[model samples]
Each structure stands twice: as C-alpha cells, then as structure tokens.
Target: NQIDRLLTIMQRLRDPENGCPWDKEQTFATIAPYTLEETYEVLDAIAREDFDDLRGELGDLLFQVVFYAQMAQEEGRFDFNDICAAISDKLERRLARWEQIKTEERAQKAQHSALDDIPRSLPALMRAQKIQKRCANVGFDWTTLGPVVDKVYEEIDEVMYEARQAVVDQAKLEEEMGDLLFATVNLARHLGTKAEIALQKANEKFERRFREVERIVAARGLEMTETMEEVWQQVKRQE
Candidate 1:
C-alpha cells in the first residue's frame, strides 16, 4: 500500500499538466547526478553515526531508483514493479549464475574484455583496485605478496628518481605518481584489504590526531610553525 502510494505520488508529480514543473522536466541523464549525490549523502550520514539522517538519506537514495523507474516507464521500457521483480528475480537466481548474467549483459554491447565495463568515473583508487581484481580473477595476479611488495618499491624508486632530477616534467611526474598509487592499490589487494576503505579510515585517523595536536599546541601557547613535527610525534605516543 505504501509503495503504491509512493508510485502514485511520483506519477502525479510527473503528470503532463498538473505535475511538478521541476519533476516533469527531469530525465534519466538529468537525474543521475542527484542519484550520485544522494548516495554520498547516505555514506556521509553513516560516517557521522546519525541514524535519523541515515533514514532520510536512504529515502532519498530510494527515490533515485524511483525516479529512474518513472523515466523508464515513460519510455515504455520498465516500471517500478518490473524493477522490483527484476531484483527479486536476480536474488532468487542464485550466485553462480551472476557472472554469466554479467557477461551476457556486457556482451550485448560487444564488450569482450573483462575490464571493458568498469566505470571510468569511479574514484581512481577504487578503479585501480577493481581493475586489479578483474585481472587477478583471470589468473594475471602475483603468486604471492612478494612480487606485489616489490612492485610498490619499484614504483617508489621511479618516483624518487623523478624527484631527484629536480626538473618537474608535469606529465611524467603524474604518470609515475599514478603508477605508484596503482601499485599501492595492488599491494592492498594482495594484503586482502580495500584501498579505498583503508584510505578512508586512515583519513579519519589523521583528522582525529591532528585535531588533538592542535588542542595540545594551543594549550601550550606554541606556534605551529616549528613545533608541529614534535607535536605530531607527541600525539602518536599518546595514541
């Protein structure tokens, strides 16, 4: 009953004459950015530990799906019920057939490579990690973590040499830096960790520690210029 009410609300909002002007003007493409924004807002709510905000954010996330379904229905492609059925169908279809389903979906577009369908808009670390995973699944991975560690060291050496010349070739530097990050992602994969999640936790840790250091420095009436490094060490010890 609630779902029907929501669908009816969306239908009315998208009505030809008595509809919301803004909602009536939206298309799948136009609505995609909002979908992405709502997704991040959900994540932000989770990170902040706000259950109330999470509930609202999740509704916003669901409305993205509803919006997309409405647009698809307008084109006579699919509707909200069809979308729900497809998901329920897929879930009941089991796990082993998932790869086959994905392969067929990509193959429809002539995408033959295992790496072809990865979204380029993904954060670089995430994209690198996923690319590494896809390649690794095809037996293109290191037999052990040794080679992965060595690759990270090799990439660092390349970056160090680039820094040594003191002549900044922006393009070359960027390439080396990207290689270094990719290798780090591979290392994280080899170590059975997600590079993106690991970095997020590291960022949170840094922010927490930095704020503590700021408080300590302020209490001591010390300037951050000269004593910042020692204050960082002090915070590490306290932690």
Candidate 2:
C-alpha cells in the first residue's frame, strides 16, 4: 500500500496537464546523475549509523527507480510492477544459484585479458582488491603473508618519509598512502579477508568506541584531550 502510494505520487509528478515542470520534462538520461548521488547519500547515512536519515535516504533512492519506471511506462515499455517482478524472478532463481554454489564449491576477460568486466564504477577499496584478484589469476600476486605484510610495512615507511615534504609534494604523499593501502589489501587478501569489509568494520568499531568516550566526557564535564584518551581506553577496556 505504501509503495502504491509512492507510485501514485511519482505518477502525478509527471502529469502532462498539471505536474512539476522539472518532473514532466525529465528524461532518464537527464536524471542519471542524481541516481548516483542518491545512492551515495544513502550510503553516507549508513556510514554515520543514522537510521532516521537512512529511512529518508532510502526513499530518495527508491524515487530514482520509481522515476525511471514511470518514464518507461509513459512510453508503454515497462512499469513499476514489471520492474519489481523482474527482480523477484531473478531473486527466486538466485536462491537456486546460491544453493548450487553452497555445495562446497567456489570458484574474467580482456581489454579483449583477465579483468574486463570488473566494472569501473566500483568503490576504490573494492575495485583495488578486485584488480588485485585479477592479477592473482595470472600469478602476478604476492605469494605469501610475509611478503604482503612486508610490502605494507615498506609502503608505510615510504609514506612516513613522504609526509616530511607533504605540503611541498602532496602528490607524493597520496602516492605513498595509496601504495600502503594496496599493500594492506594484499595482506588482508592473503589472510582470507576482504579488505573493504575489514576497513568498514574497523570504522564502525572506531565510531562506536569514540562515541562512548564522548559520552563519558560529557557526563564528567571534563574539558580535555588526555581526558579523552583516558575515557577512550576506559570504553575500550569495558568492551
């Protein structure tokens, strides 16, 4: 019912006789940019752990889909229900696919070679790790944990030195930092971890502990950095 209500609202927005002019004039091509932004805004809400904002951001993202469906319906191509049904059909099949894969089985292309369809629009961490995987397929990867960890250690040392002239050569600092992150991903990959997930959970852990530390600071009326560290450790120890 709620989705139907949303559908109607989207329909009215593009009404020829009396509708929002921007909505009426928009083509799928014209509105493509906002779709990416909408998704990122939703992700931002998720990263901040703001569920209240997340609810609204979800609607904004849904609007992107609904708006596309509405436009296609005007041309008698597809509608909201068709779009929904397509996904539903795939999901039902996906369950079968999942079970097949889950049977103790686990297992790319070219410029015309190994990494063609990895998709360029991916987030940096995922894209980097995926590219690493593609290389590994061709035996271009670090062979062991020690090698990966040593590379990470080596990269960070370069980063630290680059930092001395960071203001003079910001590009060099970024280069070194990128190297460190790539090496770190290799370490995670070798240890059977997805570096993207590791970083995300690490961020969540930091945010949770820091928020608790802030709570203690506010409660004690302590105005300070040493005090922050003390409360930070207190929160860490309690955890």
Candidate 3:
C-alpha cells in the first residue's frame, strides 16, 4: 500500500533481536547528525554538478529521511508517508512551510529561550551565524559593523597571546579560536556573504591552484619534498 522496501528496510536495520548495533539502540539525537551530514553531501553534489555523486548522495539523503521517520514510527507519532502527504496535502505552501514548521516545532517542546530551536547539529559556522541572527532578531546585535570587525581583531590578539605562552592551555586555546572564528563569520554575514561558502570557495581555490602547481612540478619531474614549496607561487605568479 505504501513505498516498497522503505519502511521495511528501516525496520530490518533497527530490529531489536538481530539488527545492527549501528542502527539498533540509536535514538533521534544520535542519528540526527547523519541526516544533517547526508544533507550536506547532497548539496555538495549539487554544487559540483556531479550526477555520479548526486545519485549516491540523493540516495543517502532519502535513506536519512526514511531512517528518521522509522524511528518516529517506532515512537508512535507518525510514519513515512505522512511527510510526503503533508507536502502534497494542499495544507501548506513550500515557501512558508519552512517557517511554519520552524515555529511549530519550537512551540511544542518545553523551551525557554528565543534560541531554543537552534539545533546544535548545525555546522559550526552556520550555527554561529544563526546564533548571531537570532540575537539580531531580539535587539541583542550590533548596529554598526565596525565593532563587529573590532571584535574579530580583539579575538585574534587574545589567541596570539595564548599561543605565545610556553604551555598554552587546551580549553583556553580552543575557546579563543572559537571566539576568533565566531567573530570572523559574524563579519562575513554582515557583509551578506556566507562564511561556509566563503571558506568552501577558498578551499576549492587552494586545491585548484595547488594542482596547477603540481602539474608544473611533475612535468619537470621534481621531488615530493622541498620542491613543492619552491614552486608554490608559480601558479600564483600567473593567476
């Protein structure tokens, strides 16, 4: 009557007596990250325009949703098709449903903060940006970007001071680094740029440029060691 091998597949994986421990005994919280990461990969595939990755990533994305729904089916709230039906139910629009569900979910659970619905599973940069935006919505944000920029500089100085120490504390270094990145991303968001996309493009450019460097070195049959750095700017010189 419903989708084939979807619901039953999850049950088999989540089976109590003989199921994988990987799937067995996993509650919502633990499995949530897989859903999140799979989603990232699907979008990642889209970004690269690679159907080779798209097919696998999309399959994994669907598996995550089905897996999530299965746990809820066990929890006795709803089942897989309800989600599909809801989208086609003529009860909500695609654009506003995102906000509607966001508000609805925030309301149902016992909660205290305007930030309560902010899921911790978010990638750090995005979470920090969302955290910043939530505060902005509540009048807790800065009116000028100058202070935001200043905060980033201040965080870097604090990090450098800790780094100069002979025995920099682990937690302290991490805290300073986190603060530094948080402010850095805040500035990016203020400029209407996504920190994730910014950093992603930077990463891609790094790999792209380095590969060109690699081509130069290999054509000349250079060493794998000191040679890589010697020709590092060869690509930079042209581009």
Candidate 4:
C-alpha cells in the first residue's frame, strides 16, 4: 500500500548517521506545510486531468499523511498502522450501519429521521448541506429545482438587507452569508450536485486561473502584486 511505502521511506529517513539531514530534521509541525502544499497540488492535478502529475502528487500527499503518522509514532502517540486501523474501523462502522439500515426494513420505518451523524466540525455551508440531506432523506426537501433556485434569490435579498443593515447590526451580515451558503447548497442538491464537491471544483478553478496569472506575470519579468489589475484583466480575457 502507499502508506506502507511511505512508512518505509520514513524509516530510511530516520537512519541516524546515514539519514538525509533535511529529512531527519523534519518534525510533524515543520512537515505540515509540505503536506498541505502537496494536497493542493494533488487537487490541481485532478482538476487539470493530469494523470502523470496526479500519480506523482498523490504519492507525495500519501507520504505526507504517513509522515505525520510516523512522527506521531516517534513521539509515542500513534503509528501509521494505528491510522490505518482507525480508518478501517470507521469504514466498518459506516458499513455496519448501512447493512443494519437495510436489514431493519420495518425498524427503519419506525425511526424515520434524517438528521444523523452531522459533524459540527464541518464548515457552515457544508454543514447546512449535510443537514439538508438529512432532512431530505426523511422527505423534507423541495420536489423540484425551482424552489431551490428561488431560495437562492431569497438568500440574495437577505444578503442585500444585511448589507443595508450592517451599519446598525453587524451580526446580520453573518446571518445573511449563512443563508446564502445554505441556499447555494440547496440549489446544488436540487441540481444533483454535491455542494462540497462543487465548492472544491470552484476553488480549484480559481487556483488554476490564479496560478496561470502568476506564471504569465513571471514570464514577463513582473511581480504579481505590481501587475494585479493587468494580470486579472489578462487572465479574464484569456480562454
């Protein structure tokens, strides 16, 4: 497995006298930026449909994940196997629940609530979408995309209201923003799209465009900040 290979690499890196100093000196905190950076690279590879880069970047991302686990093992916290076991355990639990749900045909009918296992850790937009699905699973959703699209306009109005009221009530802006996000998620659901995935896709598109802008600026011997408006206009005008 990728994790196994990553763990082996970590072991090699920790080989006291023979280990690479750069690798040996790396701590989990210090290594975190690489992990984060590699993850975004992987995301970009996937977005751009670069199979070769996806394979390479995915390996880098996997190494980062296992590197964190290896660091934890050194600190006597947890090992890579522990991380694998936790993932396996979670998969097992979800599968077990899924099977139980199928088995309890009548019992499931009795307990027909959709709001289950909503993690509070999710971002507000995501949480709203999760909660919406939960509600939908129990027959609380709009029958058509029309209502969902209407809600987006409804949310827009709330945002406008908040913009007007922000001088008097600062908190209203957050409420309005939350409403807008929730409505967007609802619209995604109605359109057969996953809200989280849609947001990530948008984020990746923006990243690629921004990166292209930077690359173009660099090629012309200009700083990105110095040519901000020109760069934006250039990228906007490009395909």
The most accurate candidate by lDDT is: 1
What's each prediction's clash count?
A: 0, 2, 0, 0
* Prediction 1 TM-score vs. true: 0.84
lDDT of 4 at 204: 71
List model 3 lDDT by residue over 4-116, tens digit each: 67678778888886698688878889877788778878877887899999998887887888888888988888887888888666445435567576656566876578687
Candidate 2 per-residue C-alpha lDDT over 57-158 given as tens digits, one digit per residue, 9 for 90 to 100:
998889889999999999999999999898687577664666454322322112355666666778788988888987897799876678777888899899
Instruction: Please give each candidate's TM-score.
Output: 0.84, 0.67, 0.71, 0.59
Q: What would the per-residue lDDT of candidate 4 be over residues 51-107, giving only the tens digit for each residue?
A: 999999977887787778777887899987788897687577663576454444434
For every candidate structure, what is the RMSD over all alpha carbons to the true structure, in angstroms? 3.3, 5.4, 4.3, 6.8
- Candidate No. with top TM-score: 1
For candidate 3, the clash count comes to 0
Off by over 4 Å in 4: 1-6, 15-34, 68-123, 165-168, 203-238
Per-residue lDDT of model 1, residues 119-232, tens digit only:
978988899998888888789988988988999999999988887786878788789989999999999988889999899889989999999988988998754545789999
Sorted by TM-score (best first), the order is 1, 3, 2, 4
TM-score of 4: 0.59
lDDT, model 1, position 203: 92
lDDT (C-alpha) at residue 154 in model 1:
97
List the candidate 2 regions with Cα displacement exceeding 4 Å. 1-5, 25-61, 75-77, 88-113, 117-121, 137-139, 160-170, 222-225
- Candidate 3 runs further than 4 Å off: 1-37, 88-94, 97-104, 107-111, 161-174, 222-226, 237-239
**Candidate 1: residue 36 lDDT (0-100):** 82
Angstrom error of the Cα, residue 236, model 1: value is 5.2
